[PDB]
Scaffold this active site. Structure first.
Site, PDB file in Angstrom:
ATOM      1  N   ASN A   1      -8.783  -0.614  -0.704  1.00  0.00           N
ATOM      2  CA  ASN A   1      -8.163  -0.647  -2.019  1.00  0.00           C
ATOM      3  C   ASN A   1      -9.129  -0.269  -3.142  1.00  0.00           C
ATOM      4  O   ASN A   1      -8.717   0.348  -4.123  1.00  0.00           O
ATOM      5  CB  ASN A   1      -7.567  -2.041  -2.270  1.00  0.00           C
ATOM      6  CG  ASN A   1      -6.460  -2.381  -1.294  1.00  0.00           C
ATOM      7  OD1 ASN A   1      -5.389  -1.782  -1.335  1.00  0.00           O
ATOM      8  ND2 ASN A   1      -6.718  -3.339  -0.390  1.00  0.00           N
TER       9      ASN A   1
ATOM     10  N   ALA B   1       1.864  -3.554   2.983  1.00  0.00           N
ATOM     11  CA  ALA B   1       2.159  -4.977   3.119  1.00  0.00           C
ATOM     12  C   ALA B   1       1.711  -5.741   1.888  1.00  0.00           C
ATOM     13  O   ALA B   1       0.763  -5.353   1.212  1.00  0.00           O
ATOM     14  CB  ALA B   1       1.477  -5.549   4.373  1.00  0.00           C
TER      15      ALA B   1
ATOM     16  N   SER C   1       0.781  -1.241   0.000  1.00  0.00           N
ATOM     17  CA  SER C   1       0.000   0.000   0.000  1.00  0.00           C
ATOM     18  C   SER C   1       0.813   1.292   0.000  1.00  0.00           C
ATOM     19  O   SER C   1       0.233   2.372  -0.115  1.00  0.00           O
ATOM     20  CB  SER C   1      -0.944   0.024   1.200  1.00  0.00           C
ATOM     21  OG  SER C   1      -2.001  -0.902   0.995  1.00  0.00           O
TER      22      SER C   1
ATOM     23  N   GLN D   1     -11.217  -5.016  -0.320  1.00  0.00           N
ATOM     24  CA  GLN D   1     -10.702  -5.762  -1.464  1.00  0.00           C
ATOM     25  C   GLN D   1     -11.641  -5.706  -2.675  1.00  0.00           C
ATOM     26  O   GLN D   1     -12.871  -5.814  -2.546  1.00  0.00           O
ATOM     27  CB  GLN D   1     -10.478  -7.241  -1.094  1.00  0.00           C
ATOM     28  CG  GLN D   1      -9.466  -7.524   0.004  1.00  0.00           C
ATOM     29  CD  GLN D   1      -9.434  -9.005   0.390  1.00  0.00           C
ATOM     30  OE1 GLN D   1      -9.842  -9.875  -0.388  1.00  0.00           O
ATOM     31  NE2 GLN D   1      -8.966  -9.292   1.603  1.00  0.00           N
TER      32      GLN D   1
HETATM   33  P1  LIG Z   1      -1.977  -2.102   2.025  1.00  0.00           P
HETATM   34  O1  LIG Z   1      -0.588  -2.698   2.079  1.00  0.00           O
HETATM   35  O2  LIG Z   1      -2.617  -1.655   3.320  1.00  0.00           O
HETATM   36  O3  LIG Z   1      -3.022  -3.104   1.359  1.00  0.00           O
HETATM   37  C1  LIG Z   1      -2.756  -3.708   0.108  1.00  0.00           C
HETATM   38  C2  LIG Z   1      -2.473  -5.181   0.261  1.00  0.00           C
HETATM   39  O4  LIG Z   1      -3.703  -5.895   0.560  1.00  0.00           O
HETATM   40  C3  LIG Z   1      -3.702  -7.156  -0.078  1.00  0.00           C
HETATM   41  N1  LIG Z   1      -4.817  -7.159  -1.043  1.00  0.00           N
HETATM   42  C4  LIG Z   1      -5.393  -6.221  -1.826  1.00  0.00           C
HETATM   43  N2  LIG Z   1      -6.377  -6.841  -2.510  1.00  0.00           N
HETATM   44  C5  LIG Z   1      -6.390  -8.159  -2.141  1.00  0.00           C
HETATM   45  C6  LIG Z   1      -7.177  -9.220  -2.538  1.00  0.00           C
HETATM   46  N3  LIG Z   1      -8.239  -9.193  -3.478  1.00  0.00           N
HETATM   47  N4  LIG Z   1      -7.015 -10.451  -2.020  1.00  0.00           N
HETATM   48  C7  LIG Z   1      -6.037 -10.664  -1.085  1.00  0.00           C
HETATM   49  N5  LIG Z   1      -5.235  -9.627  -0.688  1.00  0.00           N
HETATM   50  C8  LIG Z   1      -5.413  -8.374  -1.221  1.00  0.00           C
HETATM   51  C9  LIG Z   1      -2.349  -7.317  -0.778  1.00  0.00           C
HETATM   52  O5  LIG Z   1      -1.454  -7.977   0.109  1.00  0.00           O
HETATM   53  C10 LIG Z   1      -1.944  -5.859  -0.986  1.00  0.00           C
HETATM   54  O6  LIG Z   1      -0.553  -5.649  -1.154  1.00  0.00           O
END
Ligand SMILES: *P(=O)(O)OC[C@H]1O[C@@H](n2cnc3c(N)ncnc32)[C@H](O)[C@@H]1O
Length: 351
Positions: free
Chosen positions: A150, A308, A62, A118
């Protein structure tokens, strides 16, 4: 050459941090009196014993949102967009009534009324993305609650570049990366740079971030400790930037648009008055108070962003008035309070 003061404080703080958190590889930049000092530890790839170097690429997660915020600021400065513009102006296919009254400001600052953290994983095409947003139902009225997400700033980034004529990637490359000489910063890592792309580690497994809709805008950037130091310096000292709309865009991303407690929301960046309560930089939806007009950037601020991915943890913090900053990049995702307490100790020591 490092001033001994800097080596001393970094060794006293980061060495115990790595010992406690079992971080495989780490890179740190300290910006001191506006100049960068670099440190590296451990391995980018454990199975091959490949060391972290100043050329190692880390996933920013992020922290990518700060690039998006600044690119948006640059579009504002060009008069290509206004934050008061409705989202529908840039995406007229968004006809559902719940989108009436939702502005670019709302999208940029997580205040649209509860867009999801998400984007659904199965969203692949433009029509998929439309259908997603068309069926979203707000939990709150616009401009009343902040829900860090996001899907919110991700859509802001995509809409903000429409008047440029360019893709998000092309706009970011030409309007932000290239003017600032970020020559090892990538939305997509190119083949000759794969040798430098660290692996992240999660539950003992080497991993890289998964592709997703609006990932470039929300969490997909990869960068080196050197480029991230350059990024901090640029955001601390925009007056030194020849690109006028980029200089302005950087300033606009540190304007204060909303307040919650003692935190202020910028574009991507988050700010607090310096000196800070450590409780505040360490710490669901929270109510927001509008700031109108937005406060112009306050140099006596702690400006920061955490990021992260599955296998990486990132933190950037700086205090413009003191020309002081830090970048912490690691290929393990370890707890935010440990990151922030270490950064706070280091920047306090160098005043
Ligand atoms: P920031 O680092 O606060 O957030 C972004 C990270 O969130 C996770 N992320 C975004 N979208 C998804 C989805 N659809 N599924 C699982 N994880 C997600 C990633 O780790 C980003 O870097």
């Amino acid at each position: 050459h490092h001033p001994q003061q800097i080596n001393d404080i970094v060794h006293r703080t980061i060495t115990p941090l790595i010992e406690q958190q079992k971080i495989p590889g780490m890179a740190v930049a300290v910006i001191y009196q506006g100049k960068p000092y670099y440190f590296t530890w451990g391995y980018a790839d454990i199975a091959k014993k490949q060391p972290v170097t100043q050329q190692t690429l880390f996933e920013l997660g992020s922290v990518s949102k700060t690039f998006t915020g600044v690119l948006g600021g640059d579009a504002i400065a060009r008069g290509e967009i206004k934050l008061s513009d409705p989202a529908t102006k840039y995406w007229p296919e968004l006809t559902a009534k719940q989108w009436n009254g939702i502005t670019l400001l709302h999208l940029a600052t997580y205040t649209a009324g509860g867009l999801p953290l998400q984007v659904p994983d199965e969203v692949k095409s433009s029509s998929d993305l439309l259908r997603f947003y068309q069926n979203w139902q707000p939990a709150w009225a616009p401009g009343t609650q902040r829900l860090y997400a996001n899907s919110s700033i991700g859509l802001f980034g995509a809409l903000a570049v429409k008047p440029s004529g360019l893709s998000f990637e092309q706009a970011m490359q030409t309007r932000v990366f290239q003017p600032l000489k970020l020559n090892h910063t990538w939305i997509n890592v190119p083949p000759p740079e794969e040798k430098n792309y660290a692996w992240g580690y999660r539950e003992g497994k080497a991993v890289h971030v998964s592709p997703g809709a609006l990932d470039a805008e929300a969490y997909g950037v990869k960068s080196t400790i050197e480029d991230m130091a350059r990024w901090v310096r640029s955001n601390m000292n925009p007056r030194d930037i020849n690109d006028k709309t980029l200089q302005q865009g950087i300033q606009l991303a540190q304007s204060r648009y909303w307040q919650t407690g003692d935190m202020y929301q910028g574009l991507g960046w988050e700010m607090l008055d310096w000196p800070v309560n450590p409780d505040s930089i360490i710490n669901a939806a929270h109510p927001v108070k509008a700031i109108t007009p937005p406060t112009p950037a306050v140099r006596a601020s702690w400006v920061h962003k955490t990021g992260a991915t599955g296998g990486f943890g990132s933190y950037v913090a700086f205090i413009p008035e003191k020309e002081l900053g830090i970048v912490m990049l690691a290929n393990k995702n370890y707890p935010n309070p440990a990151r922030v307490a270490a950064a706070w100790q280091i920047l306090n020591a160098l005043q």
